[PDB]
Design an enzyme around this catalytic site. Structure first.
Site, PDB file in Angstrom:
ATOM      1  CG  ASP A  43      -2.215   0.709   1.015  1.00  0.00           C
ATOM      2  OD1 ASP A  43      -2.149   1.956   0.934  1.00  0.00           O
ATOM      3  OD2 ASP A  43      -3.292   0.074   0.957  1.00  0.00           O
ATOM      4  CG  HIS A  84      -5.719   2.639   2.661  1.00  0.00           C
ATOM      5  ND1 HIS A  84      -5.527   1.386   2.111  1.00  0.00           N
ATOM      6  CD2 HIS A  84      -7.040   2.724   2.958  1.00  0.00           C
ATOM      7  CE1 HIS A  84      -6.683   0.745   2.083  1.00  0.00           C
ATOM      8  NE2 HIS A  84      -7.617   1.536   2.582  1.00  0.00           N
ATOM      9  CB  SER A 258      -9.723  -0.573   0.230  1.00  0.00           C
ATOM     10  OG  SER A 258     -10.823   0.353   0.222  1.00  0.00           O
TER      11      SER A 258
END
Ligand code: UYW
Ligand code: NAG
Ligand code: CA
Ligand code: CA
Ligand code: CA
Ligand code: CL
Ligand code: NA
Ligand code: NA
EC number: 3.4.21.75
Length: 464
Positions: A43, A84, A258
């Site tokens: 990520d 994230h 996600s």
């Protein structure tokens, strides 16, 4: 003992007592916590010094592909753009019983991150991330993919596809890297996730979302390649995912499909602790056998040929951690994977308003690749059409299971068609693929659209 972390009560998808959860406490009570398992988040980086991650952080599961250095620390910005990966890491392996935030699903697993989204994400960047330390990292979690605009058809290019095949073949001592993948967030664009070659791959274990009240979230994409589901966010009366956040904080508003893939990765970590010898295919079998449709609302629940309910929104249903670790313990390794190639067409076929292609197959009877027990199936299609998104495509197995390969995509105005695109379905898992298959291609518009199907290859994977 139940975790004492201050936000563990808010982690409803773990701490619930009303049967709307992932049944993780049952796995914890069987003794499984992720000890000895290594997970990596591919990520935007990982805050390795987060108070709820540092205790489980593993530099051997981490790298910075964007800047080409070993340290995946995120780039800090005024809008906190690169948070994230830290959120996803905590979902998997946030430290337990330390008075900080909540816990990870596999709170004794080791956790790393690859900083690879904060930059130009090339085929090489993807390949170098998917291929990181494949004999140390057991499980990779990836929530990213091609643009969810409802008009893109794209997947891994050559280096990344090679990384997938190397991972599942030689990774993890020959047992195969486990690539856990999110099916996408393109629901309100009417995206159809077999058009995403990452989640559509057989080598990725693909995960969709359910809201707290058991519904299909606004952002969900339906497709036949999805295998199963974890809870995530929904409307503003429904709770969301609670986890670690950038700047040593704790968030209660992590969202989307996600956020579902990391929860699956943690459950898979518990399962691998229960049986370290599971192959990448074993793990998909366990998911198929143990996942639970109950109390997930969808209008497309269908019973396949071996009596399992399957949905294009949810796959085989909600992951069940207790059942996964239980079944894993005495699981017998599946037989080696066979691949039966059936080239269908004797001539190109005009599509027009509607085309049906019927073919009776023996599934490589008499050959070493004879398959009587299907795993994944692909219809690899090459066709021209004047407006791609007006097409809908279905594939019916001999056992009568109707897989949607492609739903209408209103925004997809492309005139480029499909170039040997390997639409994949999980919905006929464990069926016998011998018999008549039916491919249906329909113009869903009232327009006088036109094109030609020039190749249809049915590709069967499985065992005998
Ligand atoms: N095909 C894919 N894999 N799309 N991955 C998308 C993605 C991945 C990571 C972060 C954000 C993302 O999308 C924005 C978004 C987040 C939440 C919600 Cl609820 C909606 C959109
Ligand atoms: C793992 O599975 C393979 C294939 O069944 C078997 O040959 C091997 O002995 C197993 N190893 C362990 C440690 O169980
Ligand atoms: Ca760095
Ligand atoms: Ca904690
Ligand atoms: Ca998508
Ligand atoms: Cl192959
Ligand atoms: Na997949
Ligand atoms: Na049926």
């Amino acid at each position: 003992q139940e975790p004492t972390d201050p936000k563990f009560p808010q982690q409803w998808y773990l701490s619930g007592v009303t049967q709307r959860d992932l049944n993780v406490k049952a796995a914890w009570a069987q003794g499984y916590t992720g000890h000895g398992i290594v997970v990596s988040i591919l990520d935007d980086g990982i805050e390795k010094n987060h108070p709820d991650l540092a205790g489980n952080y593993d530099p051997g599961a981490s790298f910075d592909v964007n800047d080409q250095d070993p340290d995946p620390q995120p780039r800090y910005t005024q809008m906190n753009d690169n948070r994230h990966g830290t959120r996803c890491a905590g979902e998997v392996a946030a430290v337990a019983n330390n008075g900080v935030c909540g816990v990870g699903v596999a709170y004794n697993a080791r956790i790393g991150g690859v900083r690879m989204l904060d930059g130009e994400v090339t085929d090489a960047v993807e390949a170098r991330s998917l291929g990181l330390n494949p004999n140390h990292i057991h499980i990779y979690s990836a929530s990213w993919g091609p643009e969810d605009d409802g008009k893109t058809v794209d997947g891994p290019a050559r280096l990344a596809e090679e990384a997938f095949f190397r991972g599942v073949s030689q990774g993890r001592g020959g047992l195969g890297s486990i690539f856990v993948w999110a099916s996408g967030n393109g629901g309100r664009e009417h995206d159809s996730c077999n058009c995403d070659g990452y989640t559509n791959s057989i080598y990725t274990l693909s995960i969709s979302s359910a809201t707290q009240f058991g519904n299909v979230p606004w952002y969900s994409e339906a497709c036949s390649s999805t295998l199963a589901t974890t809870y995530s966010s929904g409307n503003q009366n429904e709770k969301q995912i609670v986890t670690t956040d950038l700047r040593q904080k704790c968030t209660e508003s992590h969202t989307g499909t996600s956020a579902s893939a990391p929860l699956a990765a943690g459950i898979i970590a518990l399962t691998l602790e229960a049986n370290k010898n599971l192959t990448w295919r074993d793990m998909q079998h366990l998911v198929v056998q143990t996942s639970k449709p109950a109390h997930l609302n969808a209008n497309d629940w269908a019973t396949n040929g071996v009596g399992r309910k399957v949905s294009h929104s949810y796959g085989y249903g909600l992951l069940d951690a207790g059942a996964m670790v239980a079944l894993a313990q005495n699981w017998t390794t599946v037989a080696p994977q066979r691949k039966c190639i059936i080239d269908i067409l004797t001539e190109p076929k005009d599509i027009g308003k509607r085309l049906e292609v019927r073919k009776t197959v023996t599934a490589c009877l008499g050959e070493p690749n004879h398959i009587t027990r299907l795993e994944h199936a692909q219809a690899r299609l090459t066709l021209s059409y004047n407006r791609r998104g007006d097409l809908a495509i279905h594939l019916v197995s001999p056992m009568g299971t109707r897989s949607t390969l492609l739903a209408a995509r209103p925004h997809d105005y492309s005139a480029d068609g499909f170039n040997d695109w390997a639409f994949m379905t999980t919905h006929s898992w464990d069926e016998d693929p011998s018999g008549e298959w039916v491919l249906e291609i329909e113009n869903t518009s009232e327009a006088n659209n036109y094109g030609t199907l020039t190749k249809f290859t049915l590709v069967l994977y499985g065992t005998a």
